Design a protein around this ligand. Structure first.
Ligand code: FMN
Ligand code: 9BU
Ligand code: ORO
Length: 366
């Protein structure tokens, strides 16, 4: 490990977290990232890390999860940090404020965060114009193996959820390599009920019809992002609908409304979704389940508690073609990205994989 990893993780990040409230810290991180003030990313991506999935090349399989760059303000800075792909959002159709502050909480003793942002969003129009300002730059980045995802949400007061997602497809679909139908936020009343069979089939049929209506060059993959808190029945139903409709992939998982035994943080009983280390294995097991239920035929982006190459490889072997992280970045800072990639490469070599692709779903073949 480099000196930068150690300096950020042991000294700089904990010191700055001691000085700044969580949401102020988030806002500054977005600002710093957008301005390119981040440290120099030393790690040069080897060919072993390249993945071809969702109609795209990914230079490396480590992405930034939704919720960091909600409004598409820091996309280029995130690629500079060494992410293989960037997901922005969630974006709602109309601007909305989200929940009252405070609404994000650190659990340092658990290496976890709880948030109840409630889809604070600049709205589709603002994000559309922000992405349009760099659309050709993104086209080159995508061609270079650096794709962009856009995660779509719904407004608090909307009377037609499916129409909110349809609007998102129409407005941001033409600017995205993939879209995410986020039906798994724990912070919007009734949202997770859209994961149910009948509601999901009707919602996703409408989303896919809208996507299919876009011009070929502007036609994104469509993925559904699911909760870690689903029943076995819920998961079976989602798998069935995904296969019936030809949904392009799954993002597994969002934050958990569970509070695993053993959390130590003083703020453990705050309302919201829990992320970071306590979510890690719940997410990995959900990936494993969804891979098996879809016969390994549906690409999965694995997310929840990834902080190391081992964490990444466990999700890949469970069935993820790509992984994302967020909470680890908040604790260990920008050097965590290079750390995960370097460790992942080393472990792939150690376990006799030719590359990431060879390891996808490997546990199921043991
Ligand atoms: C502060 C915060 C805000 C988030 N906002 C969103 C969001 O807007 N949309 C979304 O799909 N997921 C959101 N997430 C969930 C992350 O994308 C990810 O699924 C989850 O945090 C698990 O990954 P992690 O343990 O690496 O953070 C958010 C997570 C956090 C911690
Ligand atoms: C600009 C700062 C550190 C530099 O590191 C970064 O920019 C990384 C996090 C992208 C200081 C602000 C801090 C300590 C941010 C860490 C942090 C946080 O402490 C918390 Cl709680 C959250 C929710 C976020 C969301 O991104 C977060 O980034
Ligand atoms: O905006 C939020 O509250 C949010 C959305 C989401 O999908 N997941 C999450 O943990 N928080």
């Amino acid at each position: 490990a480099t000196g930068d990893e150690r300096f950020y993780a042991e000294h700089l990040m904990p010191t700055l977290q001691g000085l700044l409230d969580p949401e102020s810290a988030h806002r500054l991180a977005v600002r710093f990232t957008s301005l390119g003030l981040l440290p120099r990313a030393r790690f040069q991506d080897s060919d072993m890390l390249e993945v071809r999935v969702l109609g795209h090349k990914f230079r490396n399989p480590v992405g930034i999860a939704a919720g960091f760059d909600k409004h598409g303000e820091a996309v280029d800075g995130l690629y500079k940090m060494g992410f293989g792909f960037v997901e922005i959002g969630s974006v709602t159709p109309k601007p909305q404020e989200g929940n009252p502050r405070p609404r994000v909480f650190r659990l340092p003793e658990d290496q976890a965060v709880i948030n109840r942002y409630g889809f604070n969003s600049h709205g589709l129009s603002v994000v559309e114009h922000r992405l349009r300002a760099r659309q050709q730059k993104q086209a080159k980045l995508t061609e270079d193996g650096l794709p962009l995802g856009v995660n779509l949400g719904k407004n608090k007061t909307s009377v037609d959820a499916a129409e909110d997602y349809a609007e998102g497809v129409r407005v941001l679909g033409p600017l995205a390599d993939y879209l995410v139908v986020n039906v798994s936020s724990p912070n919007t009343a009734g949202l997770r009920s859209l994961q149910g069979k009948a509601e999901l089939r009707r919602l996703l049929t409408k989303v896919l019809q809208e996507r299919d209506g876009l011009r070929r060059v502007h036609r994104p993959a469509v993925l559904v992002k699911i909760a870690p808190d689903l029943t076995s029945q819920d998961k079976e139903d989602i798998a069935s609908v995904v296969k019936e409709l030809g949904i392009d992939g799954l993002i597994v998982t969002n934050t958990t409304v569970s509070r695993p035994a053993g959390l130590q943080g003083a703020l453990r009983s705050e309302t919201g979704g829990l992320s970071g280390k306590p979510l890690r294995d719940l997410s990995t097991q959900t990936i494993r389940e969804m891979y098996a239920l879809t016969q390994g035929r549906v690409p999965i982006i694995g997310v929840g508690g990834v902080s190391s190459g081992q964490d990444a490889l466990e999700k890949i072997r469970a069935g993820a073609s790509l992984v994302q992280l967020y909470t680890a970045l908040t604790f260990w800072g920008p050097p965590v990205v290079g750390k995960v990639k370097r460790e992942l490469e080393a472990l792939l070599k150690e376990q006799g994989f030719g590359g990431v692709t060879d390891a996808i779903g490997a546990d199921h073949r043991r």
